[PDB]
Design a binder for these strands. Sequence first.
RNA 1: UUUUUUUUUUUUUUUUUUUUUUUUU
RNA 2: UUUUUUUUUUUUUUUUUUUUUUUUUUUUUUU
RNA 3: UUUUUUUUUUUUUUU
RNA 4: UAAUACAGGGUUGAACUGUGGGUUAGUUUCAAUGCCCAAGGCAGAGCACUGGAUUGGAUACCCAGGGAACUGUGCUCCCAUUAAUAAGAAUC
RNA 5: AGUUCUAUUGUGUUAGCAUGGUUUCGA
Lengths: 140, 148, 113, 80
Amino acid sequence: MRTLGGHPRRFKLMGGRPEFHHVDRNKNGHIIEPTDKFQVVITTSKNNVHAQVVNKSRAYRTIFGSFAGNVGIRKQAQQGTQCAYRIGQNIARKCRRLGISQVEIKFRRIMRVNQLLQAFTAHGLGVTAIAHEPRLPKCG
Amino acid sequence: KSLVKWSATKSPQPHCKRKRWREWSNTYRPLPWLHAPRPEARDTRPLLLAVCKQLCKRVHNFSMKELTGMLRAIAYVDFREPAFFTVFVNYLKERLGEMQEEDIANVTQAFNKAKIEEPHLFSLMGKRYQHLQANVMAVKRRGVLVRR
Amino acid sequence: VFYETFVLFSKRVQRADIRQLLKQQEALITKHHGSMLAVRDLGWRKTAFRVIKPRQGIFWFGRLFYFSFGANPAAITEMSQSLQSTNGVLRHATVRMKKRHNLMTYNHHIHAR
Amino acid sequence: SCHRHVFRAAPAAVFASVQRWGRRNNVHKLTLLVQTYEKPCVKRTRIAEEKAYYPRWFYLRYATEVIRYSLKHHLRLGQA
RNA sequence: UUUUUUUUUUUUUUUUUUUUUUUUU
RNA sequence: UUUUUUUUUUUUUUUUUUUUUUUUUUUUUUU
RNA sequence: UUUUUUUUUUUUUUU
RNA sequence: UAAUACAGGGUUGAACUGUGGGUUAGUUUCAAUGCCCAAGGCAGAGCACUGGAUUGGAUACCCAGGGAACUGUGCUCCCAUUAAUAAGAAUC
RNA sequence: AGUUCUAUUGUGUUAGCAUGGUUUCGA
């Protein structure tokens, strides 16, 4: 009982600090500037799926990310279609908190890339361009 | 706009981590003839405060492209007057839609240089800049590929 | 028989080095009963992608050179290995001289009509 | 690698174009083959079988086009 | 040493030391 | 475990020839 | 927590 | 399987030659994989082997570890034995 | 059928090079 959609390990370390406290800042002390570009790199797999945010205005520096274990989904429930959909919602909801509107989308595979795209358009996170760079082997 | 350029020299100071590494920087020549008074002349006010006083009195006559340049230049002579920059916060919020892409880049530099951290205005400016940049595609090691 | 070689220099290559390089090469030619044909230059060339050569750095462009010669067929291996050891030279190739297709007798009316 | 820009188009419409791009280059087929090790003997027979089925599909695809084209126009050819 | 993202009164301007180490706003 | 970057070592069939178009030119009675 | 399975375990990381 | 060196085969043009041939031991080269021996190593894989599953009563199926085997001028042809199940001439 | 000459070369052998899946490193 008492289920929570988060990471139990991180919840135990809570001490009342606000959000975005451990993230490093810049010289000016601003977490993010109005002039910036983002490109989320999504990687799919059989059981789990990861999607981290990469900032192109900071020499490709990561800001935050999420996984199946950060939404309260474990065991075989991750293989279900809801696991991908829930992860996308968290990214879209968290995007509005930082103050970003337009974020690019990048992925290597096309297997679990349908639930994430649909969830982004249901909150406000739009899509400006789609990038696909499959690193297919060039040798036997 | 041109005064700041004259009083600026590009140098390559040593890096913070590795002293062998170099990073290009900017150094501005100090001015010792703009802050002092002029008791001899009738106008006892200095040359710097006089420009600011007239600018705020006739802000409406200036266009958007003509406003960010003048504000960006005042902060480049070490003008630590947060009250001066706090008058334009209400004027800019009501005219955010009429702001060009160049205007965004010419206004953030001013507040940051003077150590004026404003979250209610910087949060709104982020959306405007991204919306304008919604029609330009740029890739890595190739540049801008598709524009509009 | 006749042979051709295309050498791509770097930005870090002065005129001093180019003269030295060519002089060294001529030694081998003469050794094997040969003679130089002609030396020409092609100027600078833009590179499609960045070149990452170890212990050399990263470059985006270079100076393309061309020189024709003739010697024994066994001299190709000696020449090829010498270029690789020398600095400045990031990429090179040796192409045999053909009868019709060549950079000597056939250099006009390529792109036009 | 493929890159597309969204301009006055819905995300769903744009996403339908990149999906078909992989089929031409067989991106999906090559991705799965490398994941698992396939014996050389199996590839010997699989490579030959694909050279007889695919050609037949092209001929049948053209036949279906004539049926749809003629259905909307009626008429019929004969030994005239 | 390597350069990442932009504009057009100019060859101009910001950033800079490896990231990420939490849901509902 | 994900992302990013800048030069160590082993290995070398992904792309590139084709509607099987000679009198169709060839495979074995019957069920 | 990660990986893996129809499902699960072993194994690995420790502010 | 881009470049270069050595030497073969196939298609077409000229010259020369003027029946040179088919099959082939008491013969001679090459010949996948496995095994003996030898050389070896610092990648990607895995037989044997106590390393986490079985059953409606027995198991190698599904993960992970794992010191044999994987480049040879050699010893050497057991097989589902390498481009159909005839090496040649005549009738299109 | 065979020899010589000429055009043609993803057929045998071949040490350095370029690119790439995996792997490896973190002033």
